[PDB]
Amino acid sequence: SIDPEKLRDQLLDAFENKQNELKSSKAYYDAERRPDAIGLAVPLDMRKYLAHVGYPRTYVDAIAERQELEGFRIPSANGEEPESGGENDPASELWDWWQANNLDIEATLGHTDALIYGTAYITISMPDPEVDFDVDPEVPLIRVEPPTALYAEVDPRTRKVLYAIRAIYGADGNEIVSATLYLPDTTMTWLRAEGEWEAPTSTPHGLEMVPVIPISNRTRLSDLYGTSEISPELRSVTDAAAQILMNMQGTANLMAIPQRLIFGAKPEELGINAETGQRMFDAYMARILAFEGGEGAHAEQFSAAELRNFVDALDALDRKAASYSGLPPQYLSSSSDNPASAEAIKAAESRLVKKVERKNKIFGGAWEQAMRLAYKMVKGGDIPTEYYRMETVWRDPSTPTYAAKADAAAKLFANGAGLIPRERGWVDMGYTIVEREQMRQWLEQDQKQG
Amino acid sequence: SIDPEKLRDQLLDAFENKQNELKSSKAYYDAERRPDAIGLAVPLDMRKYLAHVGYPRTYVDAIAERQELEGFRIPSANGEEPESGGENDPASELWDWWQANNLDIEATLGHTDALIYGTAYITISMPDPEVDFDVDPEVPLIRVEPPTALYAEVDPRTRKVLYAIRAIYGADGNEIVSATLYLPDTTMTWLRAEGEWEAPTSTPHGLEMVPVIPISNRTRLSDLYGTSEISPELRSVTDAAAQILMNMQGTANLMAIPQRLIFGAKPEELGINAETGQRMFDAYMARILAFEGGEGAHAEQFSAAELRNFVDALDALDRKAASYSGLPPQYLSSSSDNPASAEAIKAAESRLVKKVERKNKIFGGAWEQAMRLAYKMVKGGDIPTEYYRMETVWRDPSTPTYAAKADAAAKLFANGAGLIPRERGWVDMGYTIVEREQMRQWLEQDQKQG
Amino acid sequence: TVRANPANYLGTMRTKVATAIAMAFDNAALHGTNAPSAFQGYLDQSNKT
Amino acid sequence: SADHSQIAQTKDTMFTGYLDPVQAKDYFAEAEKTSIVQRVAQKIPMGATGIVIPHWTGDVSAQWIGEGDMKPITKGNMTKRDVHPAKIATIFVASAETVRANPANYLGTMRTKVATAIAMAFDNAALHGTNAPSAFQGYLDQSNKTQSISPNAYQGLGVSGLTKLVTDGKKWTHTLLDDTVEPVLNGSVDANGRPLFVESTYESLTTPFREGRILGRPTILSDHVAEGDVVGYAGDFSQIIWGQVGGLSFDVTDQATLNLGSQESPNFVSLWQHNLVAVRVEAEYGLLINDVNAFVKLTFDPVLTTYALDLDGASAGNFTLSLDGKTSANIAYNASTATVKSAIVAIDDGVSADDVTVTGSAGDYTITVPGTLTADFSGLTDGEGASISVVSVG
């Protein structure tokens, strides 16, 4: 065993150390200045005119805003039993706790911090009415935190969390106002002002387990912590595109125009005022300048830069980014694509739809475990063995091509004479587990009319 | 017989020897800096600007995300349950353990590490309630582990594992924290390897087999140990593309614009400051520079380099990366011929889809044996002979095309007057074995109502 | 010596080094005793006693 | 670095052919010479810190008594020795492209060749004693006993040779012979000219070359037991024990730095800078022979034996020699070489003044004689390490 004061100071160390890693990926999503993005043709006084490129934000958003949870399928013991509901039902209990915490909002944020930084953390507690929560005090208070505010030590031995620290800064002040340590069997919190840590408040819990769970963007089993979704391939083409935008925007300020020259005229033949170095032309349209020179005199010009000669490099980098990322061609390569049929959409969308379907499994494994802790805390007993078997169920991440779904499902059902019992007609139409309980009522209400 | 303390040391040496190889194929999927990727024409400072290429990442993702297990078939002794009764049958018995271990999450990752490094392992154990938690105590604990954390030696004659070692590092400490050695007669683990090396915890087991089995990407019988899917053939084009892309990225800084020259008057006559070698050309757009232009002065420019010379070479290499990998031509962005037809999708997918069906077979052969071991361990007796005839069932890897299958299935079934039994209608429509056995219940509800 | 790790010397050495590194930082900050040129002042440098 | 390097493998001269379609097996390759000592001596479990072996030694005693004779007192005694493992190692190096190519399976071949070279080094350290690190307690060539096989092997092994074992109580339990001894077994004949060790129309190998028993003792054969004039051993192979710590290691690197020179004269090569790959091979062994005199060295001809007798810097007293159990006069410590030769030729029989040889100086006598020489330093007042050993010719 060890004291919590050592653990706090030694974990606030590891936590503050970790921030120097995360800042490297924050700089891509949030499109900050990066040294390697500067365009080297641009002269030193124009290099303040940075050009940012949106590939990292686009690729993270295009995964994140496709996925939402619809329920938990705990199977019935001693034979399967759908349509079981209310106080009888182990699934709608978990959905009540999901809904009462507004996890429909806090999860879809917490997922994108997990895609940006590679991880985020679920936390569970009973509430305490001595804090003015405005939460149902019978419901487990479930929260999600970014790795910029919670850090957890993990066993490589067995992949369970050892202990974890939450830290709260004064927001712009950037100095810690409170910190919380989660031990295997209690949670402790300090607060500080004048730099004095006040005596730790605490709250025991009955679990063997630390009440924190990592969402982790695992790419492989060989990842322990998981990694940013903004891959080193996508970073490299992001910065390559940023340099070419700067070299373009620079060239368009100096060389898009030809430079005009005269040779063999002495400045006194032209009347160039020696104090100031240029006489005023008029240039009001059709005027022919007569002004003189020797027999060796003539006019010359340097050509414009051909700006097309950069643009066909930018087109090539879009065609890189559209492949290194999963994205449909028209998100990045905004060029000549023709997704103009309901089957064609399913083709062009396929590689992104399938990436989100894999991420749904990876995040589902964390949410499943978090709801087991919530039950084990609230109901206090050992987990009913059904809850080891459950899955999270997720929204279909593809475009809702509803007319093509409807004509197909109607042919299968064939007004009840057909191949499919009415319920799989709903699930193929994609109506959510939460909603299909209302269609139980409305179908029953219609059977009284005929 | 064999000294276990010796054999542990000997297998840690054999395990570290494998990492020297794996560090080379990891570097293609993670896109670390590689010696062959540097663009030779780029100057010695600008060689910091690497150009990571994502073909390996793309090609392994597009296989590993299509794969999904959906059940087991165990051909019964002939009777009233030819494949299943719906509960208390071999198919349900294995699928229970698969759910309880979350292998739908873990094995999706396990296939990824198996395609990258060329092999990965399934380790089968009874849970110990003194050591491990959040698992159902009556089911076998199944883990999948990558070759960066486990090594197994094969008797080349019998093609079965002789012994294997799981080696866990202390994360950032770069040292072994624990090691576990699996024998045919027992497992054995030395719980700490940092500070003092602790004494072994043994645990005997009833099997003749050692309780680990390799998944291997074995493409051909002569590959007696598994081989990476990122073939030497695809590695070469990945590195070749990086050179072209980096040579372009240098050219876009130095050479995309013409360099302007004047060959006439001496610097002091051109009004150049002799100390700095410069003058401020006050180049707002319309202005004409005038020169005295002695000795037959002229001005001229070196050309811009045509960046489309490199674009032609990137397009050629994209056509090659598509041809080698067998990805759809759209996944490389290689050509804009988007397959806007229900059947044209089956054509464009055809080689990727078929390749995935072969990876499904080759990994299914290992997942069978893992369940044969798990049953033999849990039930203790020798296995019923139908488990030697087991078959894994995998989800169809083709993109759904739901409405095309829907019209076809309804046309065949014809309200029960048709060609095929209702049950086959569900199989061809592509519902999983769990969806099939669930959907039967709703059909009885509908027929019971009338 | 690494294989045998007598008296856990390779473990104890880490914490004794970490202790020495922490102690050097106090001495550099309080009395400047060996401070690198990058440190701006130390408390013993005050003009008042 | 370079072509041709005498320490590291580039795509050197020797590889040149091994890319053509014209290649074949080596139709004449040798099989590897595995260790013989590891096959006959019992293997002992050993840790890196070595082992302690105890031995009882006290002469516990009892006496006959009459009624009421007050009964005598006795006490036991015991001692121990410890055995520490030594280490043997080597490194070899090739270019990274040579490792990617693996021409003619050179890397694999090298792994087998070092494994074999270490095994032969352990035999040579246990038998001849060629380079034995200080921790090996004795080596088999140190025996003060020899026998000649050539004219008749049965009389050699089973009678003359056995006589000089059992006289000291040392049990004959095995015999180990070199593969080159086969002719003097085939030439072992009776007075009618029939063989001894084979029968009938002479179809089979002789029974020892089937690894059969001789006079109940097993025969062990190998192709590298001969070390000069010595061509085999016979004796109590229970007296030799050995152990290996762990197993044959193979660490690998592309990025360490190697001194190709000496500790006193560096010549560093960075493996990273020259794009080289290197392998580090190591094993650790311990050995103990409890009594070196329990073995007879077997030879063809009736050769003499040569010895060093050391007085350990003793300043006063006398010492004694013995030769096949006959005993010398009592000899003063600082005897002349002529006095020591006189002391040997004064022995009862066979000590002819042309064969017996002495060649050292006062207190440090190199001696050569036809027989088992031994000494007792009782009556020497000084030099507590005063001692006798056989020594190698060169």
UniProtKB/TrEMBL annotation, chains A, B:
<dbReference type="Pfam" id="PF05133">
    <property type="entry name" value="SPP1_portal"/>
</dbReference>
<dbReference type="InterPro" id="IPR021145">
    <property type="entry name" value="Portal_protein_SPP1_Gp6-like"/>
</dbReference>
<protein>
    <submittedName>
        <fullName>Portal protein</fullName>
    </submittedName>
</protein>
Automatic annotation (TrEMBL), chain C:
<protein>
    <submittedName>
        <fullName>Major capsid protein</fullName>
    </submittedName>
</protein>
From TrEMBL, chain D:
<dbReference type="Pfam" id="PF05065">
    <property type="entry name" value="Phage_capsid"/>
</dbReference>
<keyword id="KW-0946">Virion</keyword>
<feature type="domain" description="Phage capsid-like C-terminal">
    <location>
        <begin position="24"/>
        <end position="300"/>
    </location>
</feature>
<dbReference type="GO" id="GO:0044423">
    <property type="term" value="C:virion component"/>
</dbReference>
<dbReference type="InterPro" id="IPR024455">
    <property type="entry name" value="Phage_capsid"/>
</dbReference>
<protein>
    <submittedName>
        <fullName>Major capsid protein</fullName>
    </submittedName>
</protein>
<dbReference type="InterPro" id="IPR054612">
    <property type="entry name" value="Phage_capsid-like_C"/>
</dbReference>
